[PDB]
């Protein structure tokens, strides 16, 4: 009769790209698009039960999430779970659901561990994944001939979801899986200054192609200190792994972005070093269905969720939730058409894997492994105006790097400096 | 009337020191001893429910353990949880129970993580603990004046509960907390021969006082290759982190003997070797407990409890259960009920107790102070035998049978080279 969907996400905290305030309306938009498609779920109406993944402190936890999952399972006997998004919240839930033999859908849980389907069976990831970032990195290195060394620095506390650790974790494992290049890693604490004279030394000694995963303010300071040391485009290059583009402001209409813009006087010195700086983020969908989706998303969140959805890359998470739920519904429908019941997880999942689909985000392809291919844009500054703008794009499925608006990667010497120093490391 | 005790341990697999085959009988012995003391739980009767922490594969899992925990919560509304002992099994359970506001008792879960106050509130550890190994190391390091550096090697088989990683973690963080010296660390894979030339190089480059946490066979091979390379008690020293004494055999010591004509070199090598294990309780009550344990397991639990250092875990489970039972009793004497987690737990913390294991002290943090024995070779016979003893609570070291630790150059080798590494 009616297909029950279990949701385990932040129902009250609205700071996460996957909070109910942002996903709820997106899901409503999805259930609505369902009732309007008679070719989807013949003789089935989708119901929805809600559970919070956040604890008393209001942060997503690895205790409330699975606990809420267990409770929704008993009281409602759902066919599918939605979320959670936090890595540590999702991990136990996906683990429970696989035992339960129930499919899990989420645009969060980007951690490498989730990729192991033997443990995370029936977990389909319809949003970004950090392993995929490794694909992009492999791509960049190939295009620019780097078959030796790279240095990754990452910052992160201990009492949080450790987002920058998982990002680097994905890059590290996938890149080494594909290029054999020696990758050096160094973790630091943003707040503690002791690490700064330590980091420079490490940058100066362990790499030339440098990837930094930190807060926008930390990447700034590092680029400033890099200048003083005499490290510039000449020999060094600095990638800021800013996936959700926190360093840039969105919906500028049509505007050259000032990543470092802070107005403290160091702006000229900043821009000098910000020449060796390139910013890696997720790619914003181009298709018109996306823009129209955001308008509906904004209005509906403001109208019934009491929240104001701002503009930004974080919006692809709720867009990916919307798409994922639709992608699941097509599959259930297909399963029914060939005489399979709705509780046939194993089948519904395989109908979803290794498949392409047209959702609000545009072209999305779930791989053989169960994870949506991720597209990334590489920003760079205009040699003449210095304002950062997308100069490169990477297809997740096609795995190809194609230029944008006739731009070419900036190189002081004209060519990329080698992942090897001029003479030797000693 | 009814004090329900929820049990989450391996009910079918008997390879773990905390298996129900080994722990069940010991717990049954504890409940029985309870029934015989009128001074414990006036007017209350302890009941016990069982849930398996192991998955379909038969191994203790991060999924089955917590799931079983919830079943026992809804079906029985327990006052206390017993187990699990596996780290990745106990972590989520201890977390659920902390949320539920229910005390949890275990003799396993030695990981540093479980020691965190706010995260694992109401979790009392009555068995060994890995941070405590750091204490001993700190004490041992101070004693012989190693004021600078130490190298830690560790290997953990990928499909398991990473036993040796947690061990080294505890040592690493505690030593750094107390001595603030330089502790270099290196992980390797046992079966992988590519790592050996790297381990040796690693020893030579970054370590003099070395602690290895591996299988007995792995520790054997490394000592062979160590001497073969011209490394001996002269400037280097090798400690084997063998907590449950797998390389040895209790109750009645040839850890270097394998019978492959490699025992000549072995002994020469095992000259720089010293073995760290848990201290075997030598009090009479312990001995009498083992025999009763053996019989009860064989007769009602269908299993043969071999002698060994692993037996302290079920003995600790036994004492912990008695320790809790008194605290509840004590809570009841002053008006509290059995579901007063905080009250009962706090009565158990920072308290000394007399159990089959003997003197057990629960610290201010909720963990049993752990005693450790340092085995050493005989300059005469060459057989390893306890030469040192560390009192967990006293934190002081005492020699045994007036023995002396072997040092080829008279005084223990410096934890630093002549001109620097």
């Amino acid at each position: 009769s009616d297909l029950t969907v279990a949701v385990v996400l932040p129902l009250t905290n609205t700071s996460y790209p996957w909070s109910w305030a942002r996903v709820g309306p997106a899901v409503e938009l999805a259930l609505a698009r369902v009732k309007a498609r008679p070719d989807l779920l013949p003789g089935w109406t989708v119901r929805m039960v809600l559970g919070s993944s956040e604890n008393a402190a209001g942060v997503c936890s690895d205790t409330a999430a699975p606990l809420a999952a267990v409770d929704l399972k008993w009281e409602h006997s759902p066919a599918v779970f939605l979320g959670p998004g936090c890595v540590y919240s999702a991990a136990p839930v996906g683990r429970f659901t696989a035992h339960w033999r129930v499919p899990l859908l989420t645009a969060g849980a980007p951690a490498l561990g989730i990729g192991v389907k033997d443990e995370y069976a029936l977990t389909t990831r319809t949003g970004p994944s950090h392993v995929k970032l490794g694909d992009f990195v492999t791509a960049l290195h190939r295009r620019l001939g780097w078959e030796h060394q790279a240095l990754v620095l990452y910052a992160d506390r201990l009492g949080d979801d450790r987002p920058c650790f998982f990002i680097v974790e994905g890059l590290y494992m996938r890149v080494r899986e594909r290029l054999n290049i020696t990758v050096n890693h160094q973790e630091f604490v943003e707040g503690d200054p002791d690490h700064y004279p330590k980091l420079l030394r490490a940058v100066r000694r362990k790499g030339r192609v440098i990837y930094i995963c930190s807060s926008p303010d930390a990447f700034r300071n590092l680029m400033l200190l890099a200048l003083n040391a005499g490290l510039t485009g000449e020999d060094y290059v600095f990638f800021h792994l800013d996936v959700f583009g926190q360093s840039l402001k969105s919906a500028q209409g049509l505007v050259p972005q000032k990543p470092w813009e802070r107005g403290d006087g160091q702006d000229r010195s900043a821009r000098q070093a910000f020449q060796a700086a390139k910013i890696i983020t997720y790619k914003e969908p181009d298709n018109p269905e996306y823009l129209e989706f955001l308008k509906q998303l904004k209005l509906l969140a403001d109208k019934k969720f009491n929240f104001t959805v701002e503009d930004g890359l974080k919006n692809i998470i709720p867009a990916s939730f919307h798409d994922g739920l639709l992608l699941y519904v097509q599959a259930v429908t297909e399963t029914l058409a060939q005489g399979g019941t709705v509780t046939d997880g194993e089948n519904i999942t395989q109908r979803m894997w290794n498949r392409s689909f047209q959702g609000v985000t545009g072209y999305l392809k779930i791989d053989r492994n169960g994870d949506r291919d991720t597209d990334f844009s590489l920003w760079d500054m205009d040699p003449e105006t210095g304002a950062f703008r997308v100069v490169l794009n990477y297809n997740g499925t096609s795995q190809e790097l194609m230029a944008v608006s006739e731009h070419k990667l900036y190189w002081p010497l004209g060519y990329p400096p080698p992942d090897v120093p001029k003479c030797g490391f000693d | 009337s009814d004090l329900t005790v929820a049990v989450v341990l391996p009910l079918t697999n008997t390879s773990y020191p905390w298996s129900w085959a080994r722990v069940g009988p010991a717990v049954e012995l504890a409940l029985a001893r309870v029934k015989a003391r009128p001074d414990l739980l006036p007017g209350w009767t302890v009941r016990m429910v069982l849930g398996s922490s192991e998955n379909a594969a038969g191994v203790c899992s991060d999924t089955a353990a917590p799931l079983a925990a919830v079943d026992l919560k809804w079906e029985h509304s327990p006052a206390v949880f017993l187990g699990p002992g596996c780290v990745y099994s106990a972590a989520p359970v201890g977390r659920f129970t902390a949320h539920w506001r229910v005390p949890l008792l275990t003799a396993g879960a030695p990981a540093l993580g479980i020691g965190v106050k706010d995260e694992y509130a109401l979790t009392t550890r009555t068995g060994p603990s890995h941070v405590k190994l750091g204490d001993f190391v700190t004490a041992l390091h101070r004693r012989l004046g190693w004021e600078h550096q130490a190298l830690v090697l560790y290997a953990d088989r990928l499909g398991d509960d990473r036993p040796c990683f947690f061990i080294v973690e505890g040592l690493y963080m505690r030593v750094r907390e107390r001595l603030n010296i330089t502790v270099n660390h290196q992980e390797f894979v046992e079966g992988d021969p590519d790592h050996y030339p790297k381990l040796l190089r690693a020893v030579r480059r970054k370590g003099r006082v070395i602690y290895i946490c591996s299988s007995p066979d792995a520790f054997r091979n490394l000592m062979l290759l160590a001497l073969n390379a011209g490394l001996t008690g002269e400037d280097y020293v090798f400690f084997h982190l063998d907590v449950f004494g797998q390389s040895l055999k209790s109750a009645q010591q040839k850890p270097w003997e394998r019978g492959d004509g490699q025992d000549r070199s072995a002994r020469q090598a095992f000259q720089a070797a010293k073995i760290i294990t848990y201290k075997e309780p030598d009090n009479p009550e312990y001995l009498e407990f083992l025999k009763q344990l053996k019989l009860l397991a064989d007769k009602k639990f269908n299993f043969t409890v071999e002698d060994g250092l692993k037996n302290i875990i079920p003995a600790s489970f036994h004492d912990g259960l008695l320790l809790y039972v008194q605290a509840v009793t004590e809570t009841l004497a002053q008006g509290g009920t059995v579901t007063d987690g905080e009250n009962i737990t706090q009565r158990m913390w920072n308290r000394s107790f007399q159990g089959v294991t003997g003197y057990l002290k629960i610290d201010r943090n909720g963990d049993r102070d752990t005693d450790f024995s340092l085995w050493d070779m005989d300059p005469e016979t060459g057989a390893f035998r306890v030469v040192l003893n560390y009192n967990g609570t006293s934190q002081e070291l005492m020699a045994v049978s007036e023995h002396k630790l072997y040092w080829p150059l008279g005084y223990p080798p410096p934890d630093v080279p002549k001109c620097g590494f």
């Binding site: 690895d62 890595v87 540590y88 991990a91 136990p92 951690a111 490498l112 561990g113 989730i114 990729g115 192991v116 443990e119 201990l158 680097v168 974790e169 994905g170 590290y172 494992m173 890693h185 973790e187 | 991060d62 780290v87 990745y88 972590a91 989520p92 990981a111 540093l112 993580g113 995260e119 990683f165 080294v168 973690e169 690493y172 963080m173 660390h185 290196q186 992980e187 390797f188 894979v189 590519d194 790592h195 790297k198």
Partner: peptide, 21 residues
């Protein structure tokens, strides 16, 4: 530490980050 696929109730932090595979 990146032996990844250690999510296993990973909260278990620490430091120990060296090896070689």
């Amino acid at each position: 530490c990146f032996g990844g696929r250690i999510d296993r109730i990973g909260a278990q932090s620490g430091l120990g980050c060296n090896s070689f595979r």
